[PDB]
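Hey all, quick one. A colleague (J.T.) asked me to put the zinc ion job into the tracker so the inputs and the structure tokens live in one place instead of scattered across chat threads. No bug as far as I know, just bookkeeping. Sequence used:
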Amino acid sequence: GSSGSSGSGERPFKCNECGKGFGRRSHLAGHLRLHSREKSSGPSSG
Ligand SMILES: [Zn+2]
């Protein structure tokens, strides 16, 4: 993440991929489901 609203709010869970945090587990687990679908990046080698 670059910069959001929350600043002094520690969450119980955290994403190791980017750093996204959520209140519940299942809430985060899904946030990782997108880290796979769009994982294979690379349109061209310039
Ligand atoms: Zn993430």
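Adding what we noticed when we looked at it: The pocket of zinc ion is lined by residues 15, 17-18, 20, 31, 35 (CB under 6 Å). Residues 11 and 23 are 6 Å apart (CA to CA).
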